Amino acid sequence: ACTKNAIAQTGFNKDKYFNGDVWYVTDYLDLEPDDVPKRYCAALAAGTASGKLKEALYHYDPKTQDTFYDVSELQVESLGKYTANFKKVDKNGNVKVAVTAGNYYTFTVMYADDSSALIHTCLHKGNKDLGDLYAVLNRNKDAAAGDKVKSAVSAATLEFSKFISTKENNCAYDNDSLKSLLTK
């Protein structure tokens, strides 16, 4: 179940966030913690591709080796708040699971600057969801969370001390695939 109406950043700068580049998840918190593993790797690219707002996602469970990519088309609900479809793809954008009614996620950018961000997502796959999931992002896959994004976590009435870090998993990412998937 999802329980939060995440508030988007006041003055969110969409062009900077959706610039075609990659964001790495450094830390995450699911309010239903058993919905996601305790060890995980994830990243995304976000950009406009031929006028369309897109995300490309990467998930990797470093223990099981379970790997999947997704291409998402985003619709705007309000500034910084989106509803996204998704199709599961290989790293080259070939479709494994097509866009499907009922497979979507909400995506809210609660805070962002040029290097760091705090997002909320509620994933739905038909009648199931994956709980309220918060993620701390950085442009640099190895960056420790600075005071700015930790402050945003506090401003959301959360505590960064409770987030689970992705940093001790040897995560390695295919940035080229994520960039190219924006077009697919």
- Give me the residues that bind ligand HEM (CB under 6 A), please: 25, 28, 36, 40, 42, 44, 55, 57, 59, 68, 70, 86, 88, 97, 105, 107, 121, 123, 125, 130, 135, 166
- To ligand HEM, the closest distance from the beta carbon of 57 in angstroms equals 5
- To ligand HEM, the closest distance from the beta carbon of 51 in angstroms equals 20
CA dist 39 and 87 (Å) reads 24
Do the beta carbons of residue 47 and residue 182 sit within 8 Å?
yes
Query: Which residue sits closest to ligand HEM, CB atoms considered?
Result: 88
CA dist 101 and 103 (Å) reads 6
Number of H helices, E strands in the chain: 3, 11
CA 80 to chain centre: 13
Nearest residue (CB) to ligand HEM, 106 versus 150 = 106
Nearest residue (CB) to ligand HEM, 16 versus 125 = 125
Q: Is 120 annotated as a binding residue?
A: no
Cβ-in-10-Å burial (0-12, 13-18, 19+) of 129 comes to middle
Nearest residue (CB) to ligand HEM, 85 versus 150 = 85
- To ligand HEM, the closest distance from the beta carbon of 160 in angstroms equals 14
Looking at residue 111, its amino acid is Y
How many residues can be counted in the chain?
184
Q: Which residues contact 36 (CB under 8 A, 6 or more apart)?
A: 28, 30, 130, 131, 133
- To ligand HEM, the closest distance from the beta carbon of 101 in angstroms equals 14
- To ligand HEM, the closest distance from the beta carbon of 178 in angstroms equals 12
Nearest residue (CB) to ligand HEM, 71 versus 150 = 71
What does DSSP assign to residue 62? T
CA dist 47 and 74 (Å) reads 10
Which residues does the annotation place in the binding site?
59
Which residues does the annotation place in the binding site for heme?
59
